[PDB]
Structure 1
Amino acid sequence: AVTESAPNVEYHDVKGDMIQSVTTSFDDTSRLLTWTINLTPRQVKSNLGALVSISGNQETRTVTINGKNAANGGVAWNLYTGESVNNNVLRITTQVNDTGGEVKLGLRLVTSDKKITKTNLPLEFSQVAATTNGSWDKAGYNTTIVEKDTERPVVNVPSEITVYRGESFEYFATVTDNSNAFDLAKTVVRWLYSNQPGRGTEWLQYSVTQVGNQLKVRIFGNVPIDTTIGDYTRYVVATDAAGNVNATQTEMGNAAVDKTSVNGQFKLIIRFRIKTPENTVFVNNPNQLTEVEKNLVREAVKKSNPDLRAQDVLNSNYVTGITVSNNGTTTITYRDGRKDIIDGSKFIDTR
């Protein structure tokens, strides 16, 4: 990624008459730094010369003057020469090391109708007339470049997010990073296969905010009353400013196949919200229900839970999935093997 910036002015000779403005553009992929120096000499002349100093954390790659590669005059300072035009640009590109930190650029600039050489460059305004006899400038700039960030961001998400059919939910994840700088657009909640909430869970929504040095990820939505009961693996995948991700596409795929976990993974569990019958079932002996009575009990649980479909229980069969004990305690075993238990005494009276 790129960032375009304007560096600090460390020093500038008030008697300079060339530099119009300086900007910087850093590419954090290549870690190339570009210093752009816009020039409007009062005395254009034919030739432009630039004595360039850079901090030890940079090493020069390219220097262009008026769009063309500058002749390298050679050597703390290095001479570059090229064409002088009234609206000119000197562009200096450096490789920044891995550390980054404060970067500096120093400049001694001239125009001249003479060939500009290392023996004839003036070091101060007062020596200009006797040497290059044109325009002159003298400045130093500084700015700060981030350290190379190779450490992935870390998501903290509940290991399990449980939601209920017919109800809304809201959970929260957090992301941190050593750089404390993130890419919120590339921070998502998704299933394995694509950047989408996933087939069967299209209702899964999220939003991302930066709160201080953390990301706050809201995971929320409304669960349809007829969505599939069971569990799903989903992933919080966050990207830092440098482009590091907590879990890569390859890693997610391996984790899904091997049944292992990645940072940011959670299990999304969809549950039915069970309701105890309010309608009383009357039995002969509350400790030994007859088979006829157990069927009354199953029907009453079905009545009190009308959104519980055959396909929602074990083996898609109400008789298999809703079992009733000798004391009328009812177990509802769902298609996924999870279960709810209703105490029989809650809704069973002795006749």
Structure 2
Amino acid sequence: TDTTPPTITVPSDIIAYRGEEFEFYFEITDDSGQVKNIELSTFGKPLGLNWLEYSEDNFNVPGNATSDNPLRVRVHGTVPLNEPIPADKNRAQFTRTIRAWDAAGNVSSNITFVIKYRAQTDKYNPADPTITYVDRLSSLSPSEKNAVEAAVRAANPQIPAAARITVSANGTVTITYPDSSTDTITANRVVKD
């Protein structure tokens, strides 16, 4: 007789960035080798994350959840571009619960998982461009600004194309990400006489 619920392994560090699709997996095992279904919730109440989705592939099939081959439930979604980020990082997150049951109806307790979310600049962090030589360190020309923007972009192919790169009069660089967060590169790493 199966009297034991499934074991759920949740990822320890789920970190999502505003406007950027994330994915992670739950791994689930049962002694019977079969998991019937799962439920995501807010400690039993509605999940209330309309932008999160998960796959129900291979649910409630014999052998879908063994020690050697666990049930790997793919979860994905996108945190809204304008999700408010509290000054307190510790509350920039959603704490939710998952439970799972086997075909005998043995249900696990509600297990916690946490989706942390962050502004896009927390993901970036740009590399220094090859140095641009200019005539006046205090007043770059249009051509010199075009060259600086190109050198920043060349050295940073990993930044979103949709990010906008601006250059000030003295060669200070601002990168503005789609969610309106920013990075700066100071002139000393950008230009020289």
Aligned twin of 1:189: 40
Using the TM superposition, give the Cα deviation of residue 235 of structure 1 relative to its aligned residue in structure 2, in angstroms: 2.0
Contact 1:163–1:223 under 8 Å retained in 2:
yes
Contact 2:35–2:64 under 8 Å retained in 1:
no
Question: What is the SS of the residue equivalent to 1:243?
Answer: coil
Q: Pairwise mapping of residues 1-351 of structure 1 onto structure 2 (< 5 A)?
A: 147=1, 149-184=2-37, 187-194=38-45, 196-198=46-48, 201-210=49-58, 212-214=63-65, 215-229=71-85, 230-248=92-110, 264-274=111-121, 278-283=165-170, 300=174, 304-305=176-177, 307-308=179-180, 342=184, 344=186, 348-349=190-191
Distance of aligned partners of 1:345 and 1:159 in 2 relative to their CA distance in 1, 3 Å threshold: farther
Question: What is the SS of the residue equivalent to 1:216?
Answer: strand
Deviations 1:128-175 (A, max 9, x none): xxxxxxxxxxxxxxxxxxx1x222210112112222211222211111
Unaligned 5+ runs, structure 1 = 1-146, 249-263, 287-295, 310-331, 333-340
Aligned twin of 1:114: none
Distance of 2:57 and 2:101 partners within structure 1: 13
Size of the aligned set, in residue pairs, is: 139
Using the TM superposition, give the Cα deviation of residue 243 of structure 1 relative to its aligned residue in structure 2, in angstroms: 1.8
Distance of 2:35 and 2:78 partners within structure 1: 28
Distance of 1:192 and 1:342 partners within structure 2: 41
Contact 2:34–2:64 under 8 Å retained in 1:
yes
Q: Greater strand share, 1 or 2?
A: 1
Distance of aligned partners of 1:346 and 1:171 in 2 relative to their CA distance in 1, 3 Å threshold: farther
The answer to which structure, 1 or 2, has the higher relative contact order (CA under 8 A, 6+ apart) is 2
Identity %: 32
Higher alpha-carbon Rg: 1
Distance of aligned partners of 1:307 and 1:240 in 2 relative to their CA distance in 1, 3 Å threshold: same
Using the TM superposition, give the Cα deviation of residue 203 of structure 1 relative to its aligned residue in structure 2, in angstroms: 0.7
Distance of 2:114 and 2:95 partners within structure 1: 5
- 1:268 is aligned with what amino acid? I
Aligned twin of 2:143: none
Using the TM superposition, give the Cα deviation of residue 182 of structure 1 relative to its aligned residue in structure 2, in angstroms: 2.4
Contact 1:155–1:173 under 8 Å retained in 2:
yes
Regions of 4+ moved over 4 Å? 345-348
Unaligned 5+ runs, structure 2 = 66-70, 86-91, 127-163
Distance of 2:188 and 2:93 partners within structure 1: 29
Distance of 1:266 and 1:163 partners within structure 2: 13
- 1:243 is aligned with what amino acid? G
Contact 1:159–1:265 under 8 Å retained in 2:
no
Distance of aligned partners of 1:346 and 1:271 in 2 relative to their CA distance in 1, 3 Å threshold: farther
Distance of aligned partners of 1:189 and 1:350 in 2 relative to their CA distance in 1, 3 Å threshold: farther
Question: What is the SS of the residue equivalent to 1:233?
Answer: strand
Using the TM superposition, give the Cα deviation of residue 219 of structure 1 relative to its aligned residue in structure 2, in angstroms: 0.7
- 2:186 is aligned with what amino acid? G
Aligned twin of 1:127: none
Contact 1:172–1:218 under 8 Å retained in 2:
yes
Distance of aligned partners of 1:233 and 1:345 in 2 relative to their CA distance in 1, 3 Å threshold: farther
Contact 1:155–1:175 under 8 Å retained in 2:
yes
